[PDB]
Design a protein around this ligand. Structure first.
Ligand SMILES: CNC(=O)c1cnc(Nc2ccc(F)cn2)cc1Nc1ccccc1C(N)=O
Ligand SMILES: CNC(=O)c1cnc(Nc2ccc(F)cn2)cc1Nc1ccccc1C(N)=O
Lengths: 250, 254
C-alpha cells in the first residue's frame, strides 16, 4: 500500500465505529474516509496492514478504493474512498417497507460480482455484512439503478477475540467461531439482512444466545422474499464445502 | 391544467432546500420517489401564480424539463408534486466539485439546457427562473463515465407575482428589463453559463449594489472558459431584441 504522511490528511466529523476503529470523514491533499485504529497490539496493527495491502492490490467496480495508510503516533489510519450515501443497513432501516425487491436483487448481483472477483483470486474478505456495503448511488429515480461498493473488511478476522467473533454472528461463518468459503455464509446472511430491510436475524439476542444458536447448529430464518430462499439456504449451510461458488450464485 | 393529488397519495420525507416562498422536500407518491414543493401560506394571487407554473409544466413535455405530477392542497399549503432526480441542484454540486469539473462536461450541460429552452421558445413559453439552482442533475455521468443529464426545474412562483426585493435577489440571473417575453430566458441562460464556468460561484454584493449594477448598465464578467465568451456576451446584452435565439445558440454549441 501507499504510505500517506499525516500532513496530507485532515480529520473531520465522526461517522461511526468499527471493530477497534473510529471512522471519520476527512480530506486528502479529495473527500475521504479515515479508519482510525485504536492504540493496539502489533498483531492487530499487522491484521489492519494486511487489509490495506489486500484492498490496495485489487480493483473492481464494486469494491471500495484504499488510498493508503498513515501512521499518526500510536494510531494506524487507513485512508479510504468516501462513498456518497454511506452504509446500506442504515439506509434500509430508514426506508423500511419501501425498498422494492427488484432494487434488492440489483444489490445482490453487484455484491456477488465483487465476491466472485475475490473468489477467483483466492482472496478472503471475512466481513461481508450490510454495514460494509456502501451506497454510491441510491437508484430511487425512474430509469436509475443503485450502485454499491463493498468496504474494506477492517481488522482481519484472524486477529479478533472470541467475544468479537460472537458479536459478528449471524454474518460470521460457524467454522470461524472456534477460507473463501466463509464469505458465502457472510453473503447469505447479508441477503437475509437486505430482505428484512436491514434487520438482521438474532440482532435482539445476547452473546450467549448467539453462541448457543451456532453450537446447536440452528439454521437462520428463511427470507420473506421467495426469490432468495433457495440461494440463502444453500449459502447458510454449516458444511463449508457444500456452499455454492460465486460463479454459480452470480 | 394539472392533475389534483390527494394528500392521502403523498408522503413528505426529508427537507432538501428552499425556493422563493417554498420549502422543498423529498417524498413518495402512491410508489414513486418525488419532490414536493411546499408553498408558504400565501395570498390568492401568489397561489394562482404557483398554479400557473404547475399548469405550464404539466402541458409541456421534453427530456430536459422536469415532470410535474400535479398539485395537492394541504390546509393552507399548496404543494407541487414534481419529478425527483438523484443528484440535486447543479450549483451545489459544482461548488463541492470545484476545480475538477472538466470543460467537456460543462458543454454537455449547456447544450442540454439550450435544448430545453429552444423547445420553450418554439412554444412561446417563458420560464423566468433559469439559474444553476434550477438545473437538476439526473445523471453525473461519472460512475458509468458516459456524461451528465440535466432537467430544468419548474420556475416556482411566477416572476410576475414577486416583489421588487425578490427580483433584486434574483440578480444576476434576472433579465434587466424585468427589474422595473422569452427574451428574458436568454439572459438567465447566459448568467447560468457564467455560473457554470465559475464552478457554481455566480457574479455579484448587497441588494443596493446589485440594483446599481443594473441601473448603470454594467456588464457581467467575461467567463474564464474561452469557448463560451462570445455566447455569454451576446446573451447578456441589456437590449432584449439583440439576444440570439435558442435555435442559433443550440447550433453554435455544436
Ligand atoms: C471504505 N469506505 C468506507 O467504509 C466508507 C465510505 N463512505 C462512507 N460514507 C458515508 C456517507 C454518509 C454517512 F452519513 C456516512 N458514511 C462511509 C464509510 N464507512 C463507514 C461509515 C460509518 C460506519 C461504518 C462504515 C464502515 N463500514 O466502514
Ligand atoms: C422539479 N424537481 C426538483 O426541483 C428537484 C428534483 N430532485 C431533486 N433532488 C435532490 C437529490 C438530492 C439532494 F441532496 C437534493 N435534491 C431536487 C429538486 N429540487 C431542489 C432541491 C433543493 C433545492 C432546490 C431545488 C429546486 N430547484 O427546486
Amino acid at each position: 500500500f501507499h504510505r500517506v504522511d499525516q500532513k496530507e490528511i485532515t480529520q473531520l466529523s465522526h461517522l461511526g465505529q468499527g471493530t477497534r476503529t473510529n471512522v471519520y470523514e476527512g480530506r486528502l491533499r479529495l473527500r475521504v474516509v479515515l479508519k482510525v485504529l485504536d492504540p493496539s497490539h502489533h498483531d492487530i496493527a499487522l491484521a489492519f496492514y494486511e487489509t490495506a495491502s489486500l484492498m490496495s492490490q485489487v480493483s473492481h467496480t464494486h469494491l471500495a478504493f484504499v488510498h493508503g495508510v498513515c501512521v499518526r503516533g500510536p494510531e494506524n489510519i487507513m485512508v479510504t474512498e468516501y462513498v456518497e450515501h454511506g452504509p446500506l443497513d442504515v439506509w434500509l432501516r430508514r426506508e423500511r417497507g419501501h425498498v422494492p425487491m427488484a432494487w434488492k436483487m440489483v444489490v445482490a448481483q453487484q455484491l456477488a460480482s465483487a465476491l466472485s472477483y475475490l473468489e477467483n483470486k483466492n482472496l478472503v474478505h471475512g466481513n461481508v455484512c450490510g454495514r460494509n456495503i456502501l451506497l454510491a448511488r441510491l437508484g430511487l429515480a425512474e430509469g436509475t439503478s443503485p450502485f454499491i461498493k463493498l468496504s474494506d473488511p477492517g481488522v482481519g478476522l484472524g486477529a479478533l477475540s472470541r467475544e468479537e467473533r460472537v458479536e459478528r454472528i449471524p454474518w460470521l461463518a460457524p467454522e470461524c467461531l472456534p477460507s473463501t468459503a466463509m464469505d458465502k455464509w457472510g453473503f447469505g446472511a447479508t441477503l437475509l439482512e437486505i430482505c428484512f430491510d436491514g434487520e438482521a436475524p438474532l440482532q435482539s439476542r445476547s452473546p450467549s444466545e448467539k453462541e448457543h444458536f451456532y453450537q446447536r447448529q440452528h439454521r437462520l430464518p428463511e427470507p420473506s422474499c421467495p426469490q432468495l430462499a433457495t440461494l440463502t439456504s444453500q449459502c447458510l449451510t454449516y458444511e463449508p464445502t457444500q456452499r455454492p461458488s460465486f460463479r454459480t450464485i452470480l
